[PDB]
Subunit: 485 residues, 4 copies
């Protein structure tokens, strides 16, 4: 694989002729993303992101296209790739390359390396394209990450450079780990300090998802976080809105498009009851499902029980479930022995950021036979028991793989937060050390206020006497730092 | 257009090569349709529909496909068309023509005249193909109808043949009415008693939906119901499950695939609160929408308010609605004046059986301009205000237009009812007069019990003393007027 | 046990002094019962119930009080008793005897024989007083019944008079069957045709509840229904609102006042899923309960499953239920064997019309020991296992036992239905045979319209073209007779 | 002038000691629904961690609180109690606490309680002073257990006025309760000049149970006036996200039911505030078929309300259409006289926040509206100028405890397990604390949730070693980062 280059723009996508359809959907989404449109208006004259060379790794969807065109409206240059092999919306990839005033013959947009249905090798090739700016002396200077893959390639790449060697992989390492190290080992043959110089140049990363933020905390603990990070997942207007209400919308959409399976009346097992598992359980309850939940954390478990759900183990419940969904952010939730315990024509999916919640390696090597039904839907049959299971998106996050991910108006909260985090890190970069930060409460309130307004809600304004009573300013922030909402 | 013919089967569909894909979905659907599979097993030996020549007008979906193959398993011959221009699922139509054991080169299934995105003239052409059996002495002898268009073609066609003329249309008559009359008028130039002869041969009709049943009541009140009918829509296991729970599933699905618009937080206006409007409001509420409802019937309105929804008129709430769904079975619910009042980028769709709940004709001649976004999704802009509305399925039923209609496990209730009714009408035909009937309660209980078992529910069995106390048999459990 | 007499009114109640308190609540109920108030206004001049002498057997609550004073406003005379030993609200009984313009020393309302906490003997004594008008030439001429006990005393009583004997009770007939047969046998010693004369004089009965209507069909099938009946339970505005939304309100109220037990997080078993069971499950699910449902009817079971509830048997689920509610109208749902299987401190109650859904007789003779906690709440302990169960209302309907029954705005639908039925049977009496009838749909629609307006709902008016398309009158009725709403 | 009753050497003031048998039956039922407290009694029985503590507790004297007090004494503490609201006490539970599990009304074996349902303001502050004044002048209170901060306010303001040498006069337009509070302090200062200072000096810490009290603690700490360590129990995860939310989902509708019996389904309901209590209120009403709108100042909470299906509206625009109006803000001046006069005829008005000043009751009472009492804690106020009447619950005091019985035992077992642990931590590890507001470590909140999951029969999954390593947590927890919001 080699990049296409048209009118001086390098990229790799499914089909540039999808641009007109992508544009139409982008325009509809701008009307549903007031957080982004408000930032474009507010920062238009200032051009806060001038001089930024942002390397972005985030599902290449309609919603992300409105984010990329906000970063460029605000002065940044970007290069983009998806953070999952199935999450790209090819029409939005084409509209980003062509830009709002370009055409497929005369594209005026930005470099995108993303299509729906990548292989592992192609995913990592695309991530290196997205991180590799064309002037050796102007490498990337910011990262915008969802899941931490862009940050991992940079920091691991530098670690192996400083060690003088890319380790061999073990035979029993996951396939993707072998691909990742192959990419790094190969580049190190011909370029000995690429990643060190990129890490040096990067002024900060913004990280969008609970899984990526866990990895940031694990780099910071090891003394390896080489630039400041803003944990955007934990903006109040991201975690409590995207993770929860986003998933309430998009889980059932993925299930619907993949399977068309009636949800009402079915037993549904949701593994994990954090913000995503709360959204899943709310979606399924609302469609008439009989929902049970698994958990390791007794606080979240007590919430599930308070919300009308039994709290059970996968060992006890797996044989009775019609639909099983993993939502933990952890690995090894649904192992091969659990899959072989499922009832005939049960459905299995994962909505967590990575596919290793479901033992797909074990399933693929087990001797079960696969019939592909349609893209991202496979029927796996075990000849020993006779039973077949429907697996969505090969265990990758099913809302993006089987449908279109969260809706624009939800993503307007997450991406307003991301945009503000990118502005803060770029323009006030000296104020940040090499640690993980969260945005101040006032800026999350700012984001929520734009969306209340857009939905026609009417905020009450505190009187002077009331503000004094609460010990807050009339304009906020209104809550203490540890407030949980 | 003329029909295609291959291996002795006449048909008109989008693409035979889709049969493989459709067959994989049909097989998964069979595991989700225990009502139909239970009937295939029960009646396999008896072959109750041997001799039946069933003309079917019903959305050509994966679910219909399992129904069609249950009829043919039971001994019937069939010819099929969709009952809407956008509701066909092309891979299902291909699998039905090819059959379980056929191939696209050598198909071995049954005649289907159906594709997604028919024009009006093509829809009525296909309906005439579906009702026209190849041997003139063996015309259709049963109809299986959803919405009454097959029934109306036969009964109106006979009416004109008896009058000796097909009347002209009026200039202000609907476009679809002109097409319908053109078909009948054209045919009556070469064939003077085609529909009269079909009418005579048809032993009965089964009708699947609320709008179709109203039309049967209207034919029957005019003294024009020429053959018996079973109202399948009003089986308990149909109206209270398909119209309500089916729509709870498929309305969100249609809206999602057409628009990907967040439902939570939005103001949603549902017009009508019968079983389909009750399923729409339950779906929307479940996604966190702020739902209001319109209604003419004070009983249904009081239910909506007891279920946590304001009951408002279109005039008062149209200006602020983010999504508007018509679910009435009536006409003229969202007129052009209301559409001009909508907020920018609001969404408008209909889930009733016919498009005339929304004033599409008014919209198409208003001076608003259309941009097609993707199939069945159009953006209409009024330049005087600058505001745009997203219209789903050009006003046609959005769950089947924009998505896949109700899920198979729901359609298994409706289609087990329709298969029982076809059986009852065909094998006990002399017991029925020319009136509309509903299935006895015990046959509805039998369809419910197949699905409770499929879901793992555990029924209690009455003791002899309890059965005596209630005055029921241990095996129907409710009075005839019971409402569930 | 003899009636009290004051200012020309015979009555038996707890305490006349409660009349002021009762009257304040009656006045507030009148604002919440626009169905009854609209009927008082409508028929004020006509006086349609002039000449009626209505014997009423119906829970003597604040809601029934507004019904009683609507019947008297329309010209009827009345004599009343409760239809359950624990459902009376003493301050309502006192306001009804005193009247809107009386005082406790000089009452000016109507005969009431009802108090909360009757014995069985007192219950049947009161039922006889209510059915026994003072002038033997003017016996009762209508019955207004809820549960059919008034109707049963009249028709069985006549039945024994024509046989010339009241049959002896069997040793293992229920305690209340013996009481009932003792009343009739004692009266038959001094009066040989009392019940025969009342039955001849009764021109109609209106029957308010599912269990009463069932008994009406059983009388009718036997050839023994001596006068016309209107089944008020099966008014659309009764069954689908009182039985369902009434119960959604008053089930949790009963369990709250009896036990104050958290409902959220708890496993709750609802026996029966008709309109009452549907309201129970909806109330419990709304409080975060984990609800399962039992059923004999596959159609109601499939609804419960489609509404997110497992459908289980008592035997499978009884051991782990924290709250068990019987809602069937049948008998022998929770037997002694099931109660010994309950978890310690589980709560057991019945909301169907009669206590025999729960095997109280078996409990009372089991060797378990009772400790009364407060009125209508008892703790039963089995010393063999050490476990105790909380029993509400000694098995009698708990919403009225432990709390105040359905709220006034619900009872306004049921009681406008019952007032219209009394009007129709009394004024159009020649139109009816000795069969059970239901009110015409337009009278149900009229009752709904009054409450829609009271809540501020805004009905759409059909155009002439729309009414022609539907084949309906613009003024209704709007649905076919078999429509199920 | 009230004086304590003294029986068998126990000083108290309650409605009726003969209710103790009925109280005890309800306490023993509650022990079965309070596994958090029963587990702590078993765990710390032998240790007696609270020996030497003299805890002055100010918290709604309900059945649930009685199981908390008996947990504190089981663990070695001595106590003296009072309610933190004039209508919240459950007289049978007050009687059972004085009599104790082995005492009788003639021979009580319990502890000093100064609480009954229906106190006047004067009696409420008299009772608060009894609760804070231990009998040995040389053994004053050494811990405070507070809900709403009233006990902490009397001690800290009492000491402030002592150090100043004067209790300030009240302003004519000060609220009535403020005039009572200063009267109490001004009178005691006449005869005892250092009472509150010695108390403040003896108190080793306070635990504070509610969002209102915790605000007041932050306000003392801001001003340099928090004279001893405080633990904010409100903000334990298993308190704020359980009690505030699911407790209120149960008890709001209970209080509305017992006061009014008004159908909730089909009514328009206005909830003012969408924090944890307003979320519980809206979930309760939604589940009963109400049509709910929400008011809010905070755009984050408002956006959650809209995402959960509720319009976000101002009181000015929605007040005239509301059938029921509930305040759940913790602020003051939410529903003013002008808004009351705007309500529809026979609308219901109540407050569920800790203090009654959310509803302008002073303005209502001085307006010229006429009051008819319907029954305890239910009043019908009529405006002769408009002809409209409104039903007001609990004279504006928290309606779940005033009109019903407050949150259910099983919910309070979380709050009171937290409070009991907080009291153990502050008494036994006192040198580890400065004069600041603290929250309990996350591991202890997990411990409390786990007792309740187990009691409900939920089954927790156990992390494998590999999973624990992947997450970077211990298999035994804690499982979430410190800023985790659940
Ligand atoms: N799309 C689908 O999958 C699907 C499924 C089942 C039924 N249907 C169709 O949906 C439609 C409704 O079916 P149903 O079973 O709910 O019928 P219904 O008769 O039970 O309900 C329709 C409701 O609309 C109300 N109504 C009529 N005119 C109105 C007006 N002008 N404004 C407001 N409300 C009005 C009526 O009072 C009635 O309660 C029919 O056309 C039916 O054939 C579609
Ligand atoms: N307490 C109240 O205020 C109140 C209100 C309305 C009705 N009622 C009473 O409630 C009872 C139920 O009324 P309804 O209108 O719901 O009647 P219903 O006939 O609509 O429903 C009862 C359900 O019980 C089911 N059932 C019968 N026997 C059973 C068994 N052994 N196990 C499981 N399920 C069984 C039936 O299948 C039926 O669906 C009647 O006694 C009625 O008079 C009480
Ligand atoms: N439509 C979408 N476009 C871009 N990102 C999305 C979309 N839906 C979900 N996500 C993001 O995917 C992340 C997990 O990789 C979540 O943190 C969520 O914000």
């Amino acid at each position: 694989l080699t990049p296409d280059v048209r009118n001086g723009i390098d990229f790799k996508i499914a089909d540039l002729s999808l641009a007109d359809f992508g544009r139409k959907e982008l325009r509809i989404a701008e009307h549903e993303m007031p957080g982004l449109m408000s930032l474009r208006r507010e920062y238009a004259e200032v051009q806060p992101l001038k001089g930024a060379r942002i390397s972005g790794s985030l599902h290449m969807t309609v919603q992300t296209a409105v984010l990329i065109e906000t970063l460029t409206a605000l002065g940044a240059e970007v290069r983009w790739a998806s953070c999952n092999i199935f999450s790209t919306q090819d029409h939005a990839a084409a509209a980003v390359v062509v830009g709002p005033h370009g055409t497929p013959d005369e594209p005026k947009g930005v470099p995108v390396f993303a299509w729906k249905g990548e292989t592992l090798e192609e995913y990592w090739w695309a991530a290196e394209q997205m991180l590799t700016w064309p002037d050796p002396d102007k490498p990337a200077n910011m990262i915008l990450d969802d899941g931490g893959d862009a940050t991992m390639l940079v920091l691991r790449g530098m670690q192996y450079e400083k060690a003088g060697v890319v380790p061999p992989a073990e035979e029993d390492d996951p396939a993707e780990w072998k691909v990742f190290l192959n990419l790094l080992r190969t580049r190190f043959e011909t370029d000995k300090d690429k990643w060190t110089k990129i890490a040096e140049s990067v002024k900060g990363v913004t990280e969008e998802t609970t899984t990526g933020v866990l990895r940031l905390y694990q780099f910071a603990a090891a003394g390896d976080l080489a630039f400041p990070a803003i944990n955007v997942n934990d903006s109040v207007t991201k975690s409590k809105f995207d993770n929860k209400y986003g998933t309430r919308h998009s889980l059932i959409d993925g299930i619907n498009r993949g399977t068309d399976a009636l949800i009402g009346g079915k037993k549904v097992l949701i593994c994990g009851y954090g913000d995503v598992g709360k959204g899943c359980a709310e979606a399924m309850k609302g469609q008439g499902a009989r929902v049970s939940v698994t958990e390791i954390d007794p606080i979240n478990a007590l919430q599930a029980m308070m919300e009308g759900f039994d709290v059970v183990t996968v060992e006890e419940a797996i044989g009775d479930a019609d639909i099983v969904v993993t939502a933990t952010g952890n690995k090894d939730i649904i192992m091969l022995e659990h899959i072989k315990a499922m009832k005939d024509h049960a459905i299995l999916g994962n909505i967590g950021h990575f596919d290793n919640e479901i033992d797909m390696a074990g399933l693929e090597r087990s001797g079960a036979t696969r019939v592909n039904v349609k893209p991202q839907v496979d029927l796996w049959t075990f000849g020993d028991t006779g039973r077949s299971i429907i697996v969505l998106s090969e265990g990758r996050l099913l809302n993006l793989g089987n449908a279109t991910g969260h809706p624009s108006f939800v993503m307007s909260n997450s991406f307003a937060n991301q945009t503000i985090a990118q502005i803060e890190l770029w323009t006030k970069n000296d104020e940040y050390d090499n640690e993980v930060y969260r945005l101040p409460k006032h800026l999350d309130e700012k984001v929520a206020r734009i969306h209340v307004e857009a939905l026609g809600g009417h905020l009450t304004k505190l009187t002077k006497e009331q503000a004094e009573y609460l010990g807050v300013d009339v304009e906020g922030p209104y809550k203490p730092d540890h407030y949980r909402y």
